[PDB]
Structure formats: structure tokens, C-alpha cells
Amino acid sequence: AEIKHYQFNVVMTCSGCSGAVNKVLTKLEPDVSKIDISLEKQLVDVYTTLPYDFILEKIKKTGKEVRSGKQL
Amino acid sequence: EIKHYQFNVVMTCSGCSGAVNKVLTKLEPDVSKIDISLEKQLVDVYTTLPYDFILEKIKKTGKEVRSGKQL
Ligand SMILES: [Cu+]
Numbered sequence: 695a696e697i698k699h700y701q702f703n704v705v706m707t708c709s710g711c712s713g714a715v716n717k718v719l720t721k722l723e724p725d726v727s728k729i730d731i732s733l734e735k736q737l738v739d740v741y742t743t744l745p746y747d748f749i750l751e752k753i754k755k756t757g758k759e760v761r762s763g764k765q766l
Numbered sequence: 767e768i769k770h771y772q773f774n775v776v777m778t779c780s781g782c783s784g785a786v787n788k789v790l791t792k793l794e795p796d797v798s799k800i801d802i803s804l805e806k807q808l809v810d811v812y813t814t815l816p817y818d819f820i821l822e823k824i825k826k827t828g829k830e831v832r833s834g835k836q837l
Pocket residue numbers: 706707708709710711712778779780781782783
């Protein structure tokens with residue numbers, strides 16, 4: 695039950711782009727604790743007890759381009 | 767038997783529409799044509815696959831789907 699911190703570089707070009715990604719991840723609450731998105735930096739930060747590959751696949755299935763991901 | 771489905775999807779930029787297009791292209795060639803209009807907020811899908819399967823693929827983008835119908 696450790697909360698891990700994953701960070702993704704995701705191509706998002708409007709508030710709708712970011713809102714869509716936030717929607718799909720927020721649906722995983724309470725297993726997702728917090729989502730931060732920065733349009734400036736094209737970053738998605740996910741704080742969660744879920745595995746990295748699970749989170750990555752939920753983002754990829756949005757159709758948004760994921761340029762990188764990592765665990766912090 | 768090729769069905770024509772049409773969805774009203776809230777899409778605000780080419781990144782929104784490109785995402786919808788991307789999830790649909792993963793189903794080629796069973797999805798044989800995809801036409802998306804930002805101006806009209808419309809996604810037209812021509813496919814042999816079931817309506818609900820297509821709808822669920824589109825709902826996974828996280829975009830709002832206002833309605834869908836088979837033409
Ligand atoms: Cu967008």
C-alpha cells in the first residue's frame with residue numbers, strides 16, 4: 695500500500711486534452727490518490743498504489759501520444 | 767455487413783480529434799473508414815464491429831460522448 699509517483703510526458707494541446715486524461719485517471723480513485731497535469735510542461739504526474747504498466751496502458755488507451763514515462 | 771455509426775464527441779483541438787482517430791485506427795481493417803469533423807463535433811465510423819465495442823473504445827479517450835447512432 696505504498697503510494698508511488700509516476701510521471702508521463704504526454705502530448706496535450708488544449709484543456710480538453712488534459713481534462714480527458716484527468717477523467718480517465720480520476721475514475722481510478724481511490725487507488726489513484728492524486729493527479730497533477732501541466733499543459734506547459736506536457737507532464738502528467740500520477741500518485742497511486744497501482745502498477746506502472748497499468749497506469750501507462752490507461753493513458754495509452756486514451757489515444758494521446760505518450761513520449762516517455764518514469765517512476766520518481 | 768458494414769455499418770455506419772456516428773457519434774457526437776466533444777473535441778476541442780486537433781489533439782482531441784487525433785486521439786479519437788488513433789484509438790479507432792488500432793481496429794483497422796475492421797474499421798474501414800474514420801471521418802472526424804471538429805467543426806461539427808462528429809465522428810463517423812464505418813465498420814463490421816459492434817456499436818457498443820466502438821462506443822467503448824471512444825469512451826476510453828476520456829472525451830465526452832454526447833450521443834451515438836447507426837445511420
Ligand atoms: Cu485538445
